[PDB]
A paper describes a structure:
Connexins form large-pore channels that function either as dodecameric gap junctions or hexameric hemichannels to allow the regulated movement of small molecules and ions across cell membranes. The hemichannel is composed of 6 connexin subunits arranged around a central funnel.
From each dataset, 125,000 particles were randomly selected from the final D6 refinement. Red boxes indicate the full, extended N-terminal helix (NT) position, and blue boxes indicate the truncated, raised NT location. The remaining two classes in each data set represent intermediates between these two extreme classes.
Numbering used by the authors:
A (entry chain A): 18 to 101, 129 to 217
B (entry chain B): 5 to 101, 129 to 217
The structure:
């Protein structure tokens, strides 16, 4: 279909380019420029690890890998089978079903792990060994927000494109 | 081996689009990667503020550079290049299988004008002109009353800012003339 042939794969390269040429160096000094107002040794390590259990760019790297395997699998699978309708139709509809699942799953993780799509300048931390409560300051909170909003919006569009192609087939029956 | 990638998009082009638009495109790409990248390398490492307050440097840098210049140019290049990529993908595949091509083409050059005009507008409003300053005064929390902070390489960043803006302004003028020739023919 026009949407599947063009728009899906165009937006996919769109996400890859944003990740590799632009975003990857916004997050370069994420822990080098974390600053905490304390004299306690080790407070910076625990407080950074508490508020960033996994970095944003590495979630996107994982997400891109997962949503590309169903495309990569269906190509290899048919090639081997043809080396030696319902089957091909079943594989196609299933493949676009998994892609919707993966995109939905990862957008969910972003929301609940990071409490929204906006990054704060100041984080308050009280995990051991830090004393009562310590102020720590994030590096480049505004730029990281801009790319987060960009990446989420593109993913949301990809979900909408997939469901239309899915609806396009079920009505065809 | 980007010759084969460009060669396909080199065709399916008009007189000045086949030559002038594309050469200016590699012109901007080369400057971004070859030269301008090593200028903005230490934008935060060499930001210096005259204070003893922890965390004042982070908020002051983030307040005056909400998004770096190079990553605005990186985004701008990606956006204006997609209409070319779509035209090559959409048309060639159907050519494998006048007005339709005319409608798609004149539409594509309409989006390229919009993106470049939009991004130039952002540069003006966000950074208040095209000249970067040596000194910035910052009073966001947690900084005490008002703090002096100093920018790294202000003069070299101004030169490349002017250079990229001027080239973008030319690309707009080339696109507008391309529109006129197609429009006058009707």
């Amino acid at each position: 279909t026009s949407i599947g042939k063009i728009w899906l794969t165009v937006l996919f390269i769109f996400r890859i380019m944003i990740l590799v040429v632009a975003a990857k160096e916004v997050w370069g000094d994420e822990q080098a420029d974390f600053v905490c107002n304390t004299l306690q040794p080790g407070c910076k390590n625990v407080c950074y690890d508490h508020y960033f259990p996994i970095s944003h760019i590495r979630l996107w790297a994982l997400q891109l890998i997962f949503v590309s395997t169903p495309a990569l699998l269906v190509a290899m699978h048919v090639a081997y089978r043809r080396h030696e309708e319902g089957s091909l139709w079943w594989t196609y509809t299933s493949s676009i079903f998994f892609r919707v699942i993966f995109e939905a799953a990862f957008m969910y993780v972003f929301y609940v792990m990071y409490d929204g799509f906006s990054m704060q300048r100041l984080v308050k931390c009280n995990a051991w060994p830090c004393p009562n409560t310590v102020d720590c300051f994030v590096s480049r909170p505004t730029e990281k927000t801009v790319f987060t909003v960009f990446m989420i919006a593109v993913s949301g569009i990809c979900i909408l494109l997939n469901v239309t192609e899915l609806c396009y087939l079920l009505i065809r029956y």
